[PDB]
Amino acid sequence: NKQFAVIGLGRFGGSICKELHRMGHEVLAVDINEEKVNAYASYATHAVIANATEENELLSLGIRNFEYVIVAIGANIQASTLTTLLLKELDIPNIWVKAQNYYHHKVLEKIGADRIIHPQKDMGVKIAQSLSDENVLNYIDLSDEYSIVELLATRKLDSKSIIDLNVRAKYGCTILAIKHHGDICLSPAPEDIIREQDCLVIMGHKKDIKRFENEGM
Amino acid sequence: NKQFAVIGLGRFGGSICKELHRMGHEVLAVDINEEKVNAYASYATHAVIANATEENELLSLGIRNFEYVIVAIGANIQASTLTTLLLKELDIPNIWVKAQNYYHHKVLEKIGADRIIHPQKDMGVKIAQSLSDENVLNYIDLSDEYSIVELLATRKLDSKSIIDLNVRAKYGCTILAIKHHGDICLSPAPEDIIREQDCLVIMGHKKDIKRFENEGM
Amino acid sequence: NKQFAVIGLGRFGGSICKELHRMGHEVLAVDINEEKVNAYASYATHAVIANATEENELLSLGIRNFEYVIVAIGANIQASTLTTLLLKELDIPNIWVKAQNYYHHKVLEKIGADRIIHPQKDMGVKIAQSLSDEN
Amino acid sequence: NKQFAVIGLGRFGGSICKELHRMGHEVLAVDINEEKVNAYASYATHAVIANATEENELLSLGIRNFEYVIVAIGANIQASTLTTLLLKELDIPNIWVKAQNYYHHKVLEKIGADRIIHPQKDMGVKIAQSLSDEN
Amino acid sequence: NKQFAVIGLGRFGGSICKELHRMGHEVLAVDINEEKVNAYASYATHAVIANATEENELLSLGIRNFEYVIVAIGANIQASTLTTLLLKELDIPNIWVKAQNYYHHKVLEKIGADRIIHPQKDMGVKIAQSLSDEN
Amino acid sequence: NKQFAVIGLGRFGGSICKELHRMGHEVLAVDINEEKVNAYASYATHAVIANATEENELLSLGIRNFEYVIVAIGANIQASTLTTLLLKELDIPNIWVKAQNYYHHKVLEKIGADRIIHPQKDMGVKIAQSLSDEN
Amino acid sequence: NKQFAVIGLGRFGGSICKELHRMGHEVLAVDINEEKVNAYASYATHAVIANATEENELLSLGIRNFEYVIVAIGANIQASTLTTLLLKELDIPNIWVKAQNYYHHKVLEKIGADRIIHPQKDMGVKIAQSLSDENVLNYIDLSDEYSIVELLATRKLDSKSIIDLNVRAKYGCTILAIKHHGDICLSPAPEDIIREQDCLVIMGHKKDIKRFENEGM
Amino acid sequence: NKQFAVIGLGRFGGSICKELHRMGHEVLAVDINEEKVNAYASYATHAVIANATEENELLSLGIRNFEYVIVAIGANIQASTLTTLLLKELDIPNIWVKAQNYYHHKVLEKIGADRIIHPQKDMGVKIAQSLSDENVLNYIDLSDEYSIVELLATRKLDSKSIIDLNVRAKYGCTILAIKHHGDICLSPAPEDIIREQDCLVIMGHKKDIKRFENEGM
Ligand SMILES: Nc1ncnc2c1ncn2[C@@H]1O[C@H](COP(=O)(O)OP(=O)(O)OP(=O)(O)O)[C@@H](O)[C@H]1O
Ligand SMILES: Nc1ncnc2c1ncn2[C@@H]1O[C@H](COP(=O)(O)OP(=O)(O)OP(=O)(O)O)[C@@H](O)[C@H]1O
Ligand SMILES: Nc1ncnc2c1ncn2[C@@H]1O[C@H](COP(=O)(O)OP(=O)(O)OP(=O)(O)O)[C@@H](O)[C@H]1O
Ligand SMILES: Nc1ncnc2c1ncn2[C@@H]1O[C@H](COP(=O)(O)OP(=O)(O)OP(=O)(O)O)[C@@H](O)[C@H]1O
Ligand SMILES: Nc1ncnc2c1ncn2[C@@H]1O[C@H](COP(=O)(O)OP(=O)(O)OP(=O)(O)O)[C@@H](O)[C@H]1O
Ligand SMILES: Nc1ncnc2c1ncn2[C@@H]1O[C@H](COP(=O)(O)OP(=O)(O)OP(=O)(O)O)[C@@H](O)[C@H]1O
Ligand SMILES: Nc1ncnc2c1ncn2[C@@H]1O[C@H](COP(=O)(O)OP(=O)(O)OP(=O)(O)O)[C@@H](O)[C@H]1O
Ligand SMILES: Nc1ncnc2c1ncn2[C@@H]1O[C@H](COP(=O)(O)OP(=O)(O)OP(=O)(O)O)[C@@H](O)[C@H]1O
């Protein structure tokens, strides 16, 4: 199918490998720690003990073969950098590397990493958003002003109809989906009911959605 | 407004504090490392050097007053645990704690943490998804089967109309938004054009969207 | 007869193991320190070197079989806690744990220890009783 | 009534002092750690900050007057030994000392401790008894 | 004449600065260690305390003006790399960097160092030559 | 031909050993770090793991036989000094030692090193010469 | 002859063992460090690796047999104390122990050490004496006021006769010995010559000897 | 008077400083350990916290002024050596240094130490001598063969006269002093009595004195 190499079986890397394997892709799980290799042996096609900074070992893995190589080492800067460098000289098409700090990001950038990821930082932003605002479950920003938001229904919204909550006119926003007890209703008709604790998917302007949150729920 | 305490100014915690401060909330940034306190001094209301495991220091902070306290210590299990326990005994309403592994999650759960977060793991799942599928830019899962997906337009979609790409009947999915050169089109009419490299927002069943990705783009 | 597991062969744990062995019960003496295992080899049925916080080692001991498991680690809070949690998830009937301080007691309590003991403290109470009353 | 000196306000020593105080005996609570003195101030007749290994401080306490002196220092062997020694040379009638291990027990024995206690070991025996017999 | 910037006043860098100064070139001696700046104050045109990894400080030095910049930091790999990088993005014509090991050489190479020097290795070759031939 | 001993397989020492071996001289490569010995195994006649400060090991190497011994340890002053002293007492004809700073140079001088080298410093002089004069 | 056990082959203990062996006495050199046993193997009757704090090893040495046992462990207080204790319970006649500090001295005293020695302290006193007074080579105090002193002859005393330096009347002191180029003259007659740099042995009152040092040499 | 610097307030150095101070000399007590400085504050003219290996601190002490500087650091070879070298370059007249082993002695020698002392070794020799021979209390060697010895009187010597014990003819040795109950008799006449447990001071050849010990006492 497509070949993936996950170097460094941390929480982040390990999650990558496990999830990728669940999708049924060819995933090579590489780690210097034997116990890590033993741990993710069930969740990969091939799990190998290797020092990714050692070139001959990298050739012994046959890493040149892979379309995507992921350096999920984000604590040991030298290891990460060196590995990424090795992969670059070996003409790997896509090199995605986990970064620790802004400067590690810089060195990864300059030695030609294709994509650099900061997991804890970004998730930090997200959880912070959820922190200042206990309401929102999830969201995606379409632009600086417009956004699609996933909301947890409160005791203002139980047994209320879509026509009752006229968001399309009163607030200029549109409801896209309702999730009730795992069951899912896409682009629901105005007769449909929202029960409390259900997932509600609204779409519109940020300030408008906030308005609806305030007076509506 | 509402009072927030961020204990542990790492990447995750630090991001929390910085972002929260950008929203204009009262954020107390607490850390045992002096340099961390000095670093986030600009991005908080009050930045204090404190050992969060030391109770008298915790009273010196006056943490009982705060609605939300965040333990963003995820490397030092003992520190995190001890701190969370301290906060619980001090009757803090909402305690959100960063966890490292499944068992640290367990002990946090058992000592009554209100919300436990695994940043690297979750972000790992996400980036893994982006890894197996170079196309998807972003997404949100409405349920186990249904999802809203943001897609990067290829040359197969250039100069194509919404009515030309009949997703609502042929694939059972619905287009929600088109982002062209930063400009944004919400719930676009069938006459609208999609140019390549633009952001496309489709909504529907996972496999159906996959199907559309396959034959359409 | 009845199966007992004593994890942590200190003075306290070691005393438990030695005494129980004197009563003729099946006692598994577990310790990470090799010299401890060697020391109480005579005073147990089976004495094993194991890291009780490592799950696979805990399965290698076959601890699920035991009716009573005693965590006599009272200096290393993290070890004690982690181990107790491991035993709880492994559905051990009776988990008795040695505690150091009030908060270690709290975390043991919350992760569902069946009995928590403070040996030195209680002994303080006892010796005080003996002091007030020489009889 | 009878005068007791408790040197070292740990869990064990602290328990001794607190309990003896509940039974209404004259108990002098001595500790080098100020916060310990502050903690047991409510549970003693006189609570003093003192380095029990320093002789002049021991004379400043007026320890020669006391019938019973209890050395509840069981982590710091040197401190325990030295203190016990000071008390012995000062002709104290009854010196009861908390011991850590068999050899600290030995040195306490040889410098003439009147009663040596091993809290964790003995309590180990007890809790083991409680284990074999849930009643 | 020609402008030289020597970042890192070690033995190697310091020698560069001192000697260049003896030949009468405009040499800016930069160091984070104040005492190093004080030491080579006599042997430079301008000696400045600066963190060469901090960009705003690098602009405060006005390093863009210089034809040659020498990174004589060879113990602190991160500092060396970061500084060299800063200089590269600032379009410096000639960047000569002291390297520690083969891989630091590699990263310097990839971030586009113009000349990389290994003092101990090369000098090793030389002294070896002097050994085989005493003349 | 002529026998050379290179103690300390760094970049500098390693360079000496490698180059000398390329010239086809009998070179004994000695290092306390096993991986170093393994690294320069191809570039020497005999590569041995040895603690050069330990005299009996130095006799086990049979270092008295060698005309030239090179101490290429320039980070660990104590090791360098102690080794040089050992070699001097063992009546080695030519002892060339890598030095770190002026005082290490002084102590090497006083314990009678035959030649003291400062590689990085001198290299500083050289690169400065090359900078002033691009030709 | 007489049997000696030297436990702990340090500089002090090692010197004891070596010197004792030079006198031709039966010396058992005991140490836990193998290399120490190997080092003093030539300078003892029997050199054994043993943990002197372990009782069964002490019986394996047969230490009960020895008239004198010397604990020359002065860094490791616990080891020293414990060993001394072991020897005491085993009814060793003479136990001489090296001490580190005043309190280690105390515990050794109370567990019944027969002789306690402080080498560095005493030698410290001596070298200090030599420090304030560059003249005196050696001495022995007969009492608070009276002493026998060994002096290094200066350029005041060369080619001077004993009758010339009338110490017995002018200073009340008496010359006992003259050491010239290793050759030795005991209780010398008044005709004898003292050459410079020779050893001179005077006897008398301290202040008087000082007087002679001042005006005489 | 004369100025002394004692660097390193150990047992040896500390004893030096204390004793020197008792003699009423100007003694500068230098140590890197603050508590050591605090301890010997009473027993010196000036007690200073200083790193003796740091040159600028050594100039801050003004050590160039002192006639005698003593390096009593004998555990930390590097510190001792570096310090001694510093003092030498600073043209100090007399540098006396405590040594640990033969090679530390060698390096001190080569960097031009004026006097090198081995306290534990020498005291070891002495105590060893007292060990093989329970009789000798003290002694001084005049040469390889001749010596002055202080002896503890046994019951064989009780109530015996100097003329009764004819050492001057029978053994070729001469009695110099008798110490009875603290009272002291210098160069005693032949009528004088020696009572047991008294101090006896004999002078002569080593083996001759040994002979007298054997048959006499
Ligand atoms: N040079 C190397 N070669 C191969 N594997 C390595 C190398 N260096 C580190 N690893 C492995 O990569 C993994 C990276 O995790 P690390 O300990 O760096 O923390 P992290 O990746 O930031 O945390 P996590 O990924 O668990 O959130 C480690 O488990 C480690 O065993
Ligand atoms: N006992 C403690 N009391 C107060 N602060 C602490 C304590 N222990 C750690 N911290 C601080 O909390 C922060 C937590 O970051 P840590 O070094 O644990 O990595 P992390 O938080 O897992 O990673 P990230 O930087 O992504 O958050 C650190 O900056 C540390 O200084
Ligand atoms: N993680 C662990 N796994 C296995 N054994 C352990 C672990 N931690 C400690 N132990 C062992 O448990 C024993 C407990 O003794 P410890 O040193 O904790 O003193 P204590 O238990 O507080 O007091 P006592 O010695 O009277 O029991 C020790 O001998 C130690 O070797
Ligand atoms: N030399 C000393 N002089 C006076 N007090 C001391 C001295 N050394 C220790 N202490 C005090 O005596 C107390 C003895 O407790 P320690 O820390 O020795 O543990 P412990 O007593 O064995 O534990 P527990 O709390 O179970 O009794 C301590 O609180 C300490 O402050
Ligand atoms: N980030 C930095 N910014 C500015 N100056 C630095 C930085 N890092 C190190 N320096 C300075 O540069 C100098 C480089 O010397 P360093 O300590 O790295 O040893 P070196 O240069 O390899 O040794 P040598 O003296 O042989 O050159 C040091 O004096 C240090 O103070
Ligand atoms: N006491 C010792 N005995 C034997 N080998 C040693 C000893 N000390 C250091 N070495 C070895 O000598 C080599 C010297 O390299 P070091 O790490 O000292 O850098 P350097 O010599 O200053 O610079 P370079 O690496 O360029 O020679 C090291 O590889 C080290 O393993
Ligand atoms: N428990 C023990 N059993 C046997 N030998 C021991 C024991 N502990 C220490 N030793 C040995 O006794 C010797 C005592 O020397 P230590 O290291 O204590 O310094 P020291 O005796 O004060 O110094 P020195 O005697 O060299 O002047 C050491 O060489 C050590 O190997
Ligand atoms: N670099 C240094 N600069 C200044 N003082 C030092 C330095 N290193 C050690 N000292 C001090 O010198 C003293 C030397 O004693 P050390 O601990 O070396 O044992 P020692 O002198 O061999 O034993 P003793 O107590 O018998 O003299 C110590 O008290 C220490 O604090």
Short mmCIF file of N, CA and C in Angstrom, two decimals, chain A residues 2 10 32 34 64 94 100 108 124 132 136-137 142 147 154 182 194 202 216:
data_model
loop_
_atom_site.label_atom_id
_atom_site.label_comp_id
_atom_site.label_asym_id
_atom_site.label_seq_id
_atom_site.Cartn_x
_atom_site.Cartn_y
_atom_site.Cartn_z
N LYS A 2 1.06 1.85 1.18
CA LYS A 2 2.09 2.86 1.38
C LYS A 2 2.93 2.47 2.58
N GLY A 10 7.65 6.39 21.42
CA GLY A 10 7.18 7.05 22.62
C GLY A 10 5.67 6.94 22.75
N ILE A 32 15.59 2.07 19.76
CA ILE A 32 16.85 1.64 20.36
C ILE A 32 16.58 0.87 21.66
N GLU A 34 14.98 -1.93 23.56
CA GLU A 34 14.45 -3.26 23.25
C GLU A 34 13.02 -3.46 23.75
N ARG A 64 15.60 3.55 3.03
CA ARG A 64 15.51 4.22 1.74
C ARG A 64 14.25 3.82 0.98
N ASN A 94 9.38 12.01 2.28
CA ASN A 94 8.71 12.76 3.34
C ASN A 94 9.26 12.44 4.72
N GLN A 100 10.98 19.48 20.02
CA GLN A 100 10.86 19.80 21.43
C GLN A 100 10.66 21.29 21.65
N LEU A 108 15.80 21.48 12.70
CA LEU A 108 15.05 20.54 11.88
C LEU A 108 14.65 21.18 10.55
N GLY A 124 -1.88 21.88 24.13
CA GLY A 124 -1.89 22.88 25.19
C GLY A 124 -2.82 24.03 24.85
N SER A 132 -10.74 27.92 29.62
CA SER A 132 -11.39 29.21 29.84
C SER A 132 -12.88 29.11 29.55
N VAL A 136 -17.53 24.43 25.05
CA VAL A 136 -17.09 23.82 23.79
C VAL A 136 -16.34 22.49 23.92
N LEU A 137 -16.79 21.49 23.15
CA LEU A 137 -16.15 20.18 23.15
C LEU A 137 -15.07 20.13 22.07
N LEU A 142 -12.80 28.18 10.28
CA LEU A 142 -12.80 28.34 8.83
C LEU A 142 -11.97 29.56 8.45
N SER A 147 -16.37 29.98 11.93
CA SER A 147 -16.00 28.74 12.58
C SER A 147 -17.17 27.75 12.72
N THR A 154 -26.82 21.69 27.15
CA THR A 154 -27.14 21.87 28.57
C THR A 154 -28.62 21.68 28.82
N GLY A 182 -24.73 8.20 20.80
CA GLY A 182 -23.88 7.58 19.80
C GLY A 182 -24.51 7.56 18.42
N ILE A 194 -33.52 17.96 20.00
CA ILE A 194 -32.23 17.87 20.67
C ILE A 194 -32.47 17.53 22.14
N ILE A 202 -22.87 23.39 15.45
CA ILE A 202 -23.32 24.66 14.88
C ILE A 202 -22.24 25.23 13.95
N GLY A 216 -29.17 31.29 24.48
CA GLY A 216 -29.80 30.02 24.16
C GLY A 216 -29.58 28.92 25.18
#
